[PDB]
Write a protein that binds this ligand. Structure first.
Ligand code: IZ1
Length: 296
């Protein structure tokens, strides 16, 4: 993997590889996403879910939400990639989290980046100020949070008002990954990813973990691509079979535009190559990552 990485650098073909990937990416319809009544449910006109993999709300009125089920069959894991909820779709977002039985939500953007709204405040910032979604009859309360230097983990309690039932939702919020950019290093990224893994939110006993940035394809796609590649290196009886570009192309069958820059793909490689050390058996990399991420 680093052999090919190595050879792309000198060749200066990171952009060429990435542009080929764009050209070879699946191109399915998004007829439901482009319906006129669903226009105010899509933050970006050019980022829609394919009709075949979109998530359907269980409400008998409008079942649309800009979100896609990415089902990696060989890796044995599923992810729900969605956009940053909009002021009017926050009820939709939690309805989906509830109906799909998700246990965790991975946020990789910030509500405001470089002076621009990229996502609505869809979770309670203060314990004493819970939120109520009346269109979906749901309640959401912040129970506790763990604030690190570049990311925060929050315990939330979503409650189905109708049935009076509640569930614990773990929110993993990466707060230092810039738009159209990359994490500060593989170390920080991996430390964060394993934090989500160690929590149980990605277990097969739960519904698809929900991942998102602003548009839900760039940072979200980088996160998911790296996680899946490492899942496969650990499965296959040989981590050298894993072709990231082939894996990316497979993921783009479920959602368009996964990985938005040539540099993000190059970070992907860097993340997987580094992550590989842990899969192999190195029982010291994880802690080094944490101590290298300066999470305090
Ligand atoms: O790393 C990232 C990039 C973010 C991202 C990715 C795509 C969009 C869709 C954005 N959609 S719009 O609706 O704001 C937009 C902007 C330009 C053209 C366009 C056509 F539909 F193609 F005409 C739509 C969009 N922005 C551009 C950029 C931005 C800067 C420099 C170059 C290109 C092109 N499309 C928004 C956020 S993410 O949160 O998914 N993670």
């Amino acid at each position: 993997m680093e052999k090919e990485f190595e050879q792309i650098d000198k060749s200066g073909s990171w952009a060429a590889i990435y542009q080929d990937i764009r050209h070879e990416a699946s191109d399915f319809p998004c007829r439901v996403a482009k319906l006129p009544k669903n226009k105010n449910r899509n933050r970006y006109r050019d980022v829609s879910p394919f009709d075949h993999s979109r998530i359907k709300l269980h409400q008998e009125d409008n079942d649309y939400i800009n979100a896609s089920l990415i089902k990696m069959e060989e890796a044995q894991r599923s992810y729900i990639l969605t956009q940053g909820p909009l002021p009017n779709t926050c009820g939709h977002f939690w309805e989906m989290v509830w109906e799909q039985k998700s246990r965790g939500v991975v946020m990789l953007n910030r509500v405001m980046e470089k002076g621009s709204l990229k996502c609505a405040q869809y979770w309670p910032q203060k314990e004493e100020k819970e939120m109520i979604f009346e269109d979906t009859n749901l309640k959401l309360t912040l129970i506790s949070e763990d604030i690190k230097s570049y990311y925060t983990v929050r315990q939330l309690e979503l409650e189905n008002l109708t049935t009076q039932e509640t569930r614990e939702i773990l929110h993993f919020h990466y707060t230092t990954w810039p738009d159209f950019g990359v994490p500060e290093s593989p170390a920080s990224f991996l430390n964060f990813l394993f934090k989500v893994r160690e929590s149980g939110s990605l277990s097969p006993e739960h519904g698809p973990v929900v991942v998102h940035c602003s548009a839900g394809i760039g940072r979200s796609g980088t996160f998911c691509l790296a996680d899946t590649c490492l899942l496969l290196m650990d499965k296959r009886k040989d981590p050298s079979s894993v072709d990231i570009k082939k894996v990316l192309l497979e993921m783009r069958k479920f959602r368009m535009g996964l990985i938005q820059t040539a540099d993000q793909l190059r970070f992907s490689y860097l993340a997987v190559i580094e992550g590989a050390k842990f899969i192999m058996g190195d029982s010291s990399v994880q802690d080094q990552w944490k101590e290298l991420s300066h999470e305090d």
